[PDB]
Amino acid sequence: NVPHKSSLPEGIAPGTVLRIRGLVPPNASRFHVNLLCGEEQGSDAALHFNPRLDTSEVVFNSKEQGSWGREERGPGVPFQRGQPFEVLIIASDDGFKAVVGDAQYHHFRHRLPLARVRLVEVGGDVQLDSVRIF
Amino acid sequence: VPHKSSLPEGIAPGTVLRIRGLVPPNASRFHVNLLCGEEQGSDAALHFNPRLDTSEVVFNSKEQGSWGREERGPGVPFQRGQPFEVLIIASDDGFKAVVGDAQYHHFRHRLPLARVRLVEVGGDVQLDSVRIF
Ligand SMILES: O=C[C@H](O)[C@@H](O)[C@H](O[C@@H]1O[C@H](CO)[C@H](O)[C@H](O)[C@H]1O)[C@H](O)CO
Ligand SMILES: O=C[C@H](O)[C@@H](O)[C@H](O[C@@H]1O[C@H](CO)[C@H](O)[C@H](O)[C@H]1O)[C@H](O)CO
C-alpha cells in the first residue's frame, strides 16, 4: 500500500477540496489523512484525520510543537474492512468539513491558520485508488 | 425529475455542490443554476449548461434580465448515455467546476456569494444525487 505525499507550496484556501478514494484492507488497523505544515518528520499538523478500524472510532486532531491537541471524534465509523470509501476534506473559512460517502461526517474548526498548510499525506492501512486536490 | 432547493442564507467559500447522474442517450442539454431568488428569471450567479447538441459547455451569469459574457470550457466532458460526477466548488474568487477526475473550468464570480438563494438542476439529465456540502 503506497502512501500519498504531495506538496502544496501555494497553500490551500477556503474552497479547496481533497478527494480520497480507496479501499480499507480486510486486515486493516488504522489509516490517516494529514494536512501538514512542512516536510520534516514531526512537522505541525493542521488536521490529522484518523479512521481507526481496530478501536472503532474516527479521531480528529491537530499537532503543534510535537504535542497533539484536544481530540475530536466523529459519530460512528463510516468505514469497513474490505469495503471501498470516498472522503472529501473541504476547507472553508471556519474549518474542515469531512464528508464520507453521501453525508457530512464531522466539522473540525481551524486551530492552526489555514495558511500554514503546505503538504498533504495519506497513509497507513489503506489502498489508495485516487487522491486529488481541487 | 429536476432538483430545486433553497439556500436561504447564501453560500460561502467552501460550499460544495456535488451532482451525480446520467446523460440520457438522446440528451440535448441540461443545466445547473445558482440563482439569487425564486420568482422571475431571478438573477443567476452561475448558469452551467452542458450542451450535447452543440458540443459545448457554457457558463454565464444573469443580472436584471441580461446575460453576461459567456465562458466556455475546454471540450465536452459529458457523453450521451454516460454517468457523470460534477463538483461545483465555491471559493472567494469564483466557482471551480470539476468533472470526472479533473478541474474543468474556473468561473470567476460576477455576483456575490451571499446573494445566492437557490440551486436548480434540470433539463435532459437523470439525477442520482444532488448534495450541498
Ligand atoms: O484512546 C485515546 C487516546 O487519546 C489515543 O487517542 C492517543 O492516540 C494517539 O492519537 C493521536 C491523535 O490524537 C495519533 O493518532 C496517534 O497516532 C495516536 O497514538 C494516545 O496518545 C495513545 O493512547
Ligand atoms: O453562442 C450562442 C449564443 O451566445 C447562445 O449561447 C445564447 O443562448 C443562451 O445562452 C445562455 C447563457 O449565455 C443560456 O444558456 C440561455 O438559455 C441560452 O438561450 C444566445 O443568447 C441564444 O441566441
Curated annotation (Swiss-Prot), chain B:
Its main location: cytoplasm. GO terms for biological process: apoptotic process; heterophilic cell-cell adhesion via plasma membrane cell adhesion molecules. PROSITE patterns: GALECTIN. A beta-D-galactoside binds at W67, G68, R69, E70, E71, R72, G73. The keyword Electron transport does not apply. Mainly expressed in stratified squamous epithelium. Induction: By p53/TP53. It is found in: Cytoplasm; Nucleus; Secreted. Could be involved in cell-cell and/or cell-matrix interactions necessary for normal growth control. Pro-apoptotic protein that functions intracellularly upstream of JNK activation and cytochrome c release. This is Galectin-7. It comes from Homo sapiens (Human). The gene is LGALS7.
